[PDB]
From Swiss-Prot, chain A:
Keywords: Isomerase, Lipid metabolism, Steroid metabolism
Record note on what altering residue 31 to S does: Reduces activity 4-fold
Entry protein name: Steroid Delta-isomerase
Lineage: Bacteria, Pseudomonadati, Pseudomonadota, Gammaproteobacteria, Pseudomonadales
Effect of residue 15 to F: Reduces activity 2000-fold. Reduces activity 10000-fold
Originating organism: Pseudomonas putida (Arthrobacter siderocapsulatus)
Binding positions (substrate): 100
Amino acid sequence: NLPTAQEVQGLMARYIELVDVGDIEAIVQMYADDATVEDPFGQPPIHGREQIAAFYRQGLGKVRACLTGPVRASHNGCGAMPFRVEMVWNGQPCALDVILVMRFDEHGRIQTMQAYWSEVNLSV
Amino acid sequence: NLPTAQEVQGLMARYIELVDVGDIEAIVQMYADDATVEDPFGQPPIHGREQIAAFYRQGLKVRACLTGPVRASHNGCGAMPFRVEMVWNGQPCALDVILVMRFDEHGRIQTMQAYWSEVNLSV
């Protein structure tokens, strides 16, 4: 938890940009070795780089993503941000509203990623 | 973690409304008798309804509303984006915030964490 609030905002805005462009390798590089992903939150934690990379490959491997509000950062290396994801479901264009909560480490890398959303946040 | 995703959305929407009207006691009742509040996150947690009541009384002359839909989980958790309009030095300012909540088997808030810093403030 070394990054300042402003650095958190930058790191999280960057994350959205990478998701939006679909650079899986760049996204995976943002994580720390022991990082965990809970997406959607409530689902078992995903750990291990190979696993996290596989997670993003099945998700991003025409997906678009944008911030729908400013990043909310803390002074202990954590942040939360609202965004919308455009993808395809059941063979049809849809939109998903999500809120990502991340904890960064002393190296500026993602230690924990928690994405809140459910079926109610989906719109076809 | 009893509230369903839809219920979570309803509970969290109602919370914003209580803050908007400033009903401190009704806000306090939404919390579990032994709930924890971290506001802003990064700060020491406050424990129990007595401490939480004092916390909200100190804070709540204030306007609050959702700025986006509530994102709910299937395990009684949720997160929502909202803004608060308050007065500072007789001057009107705004604060952008994102709250994360975990409700218990009784539909009461067990834990609440508000993410924000002075960089989300706009006077």
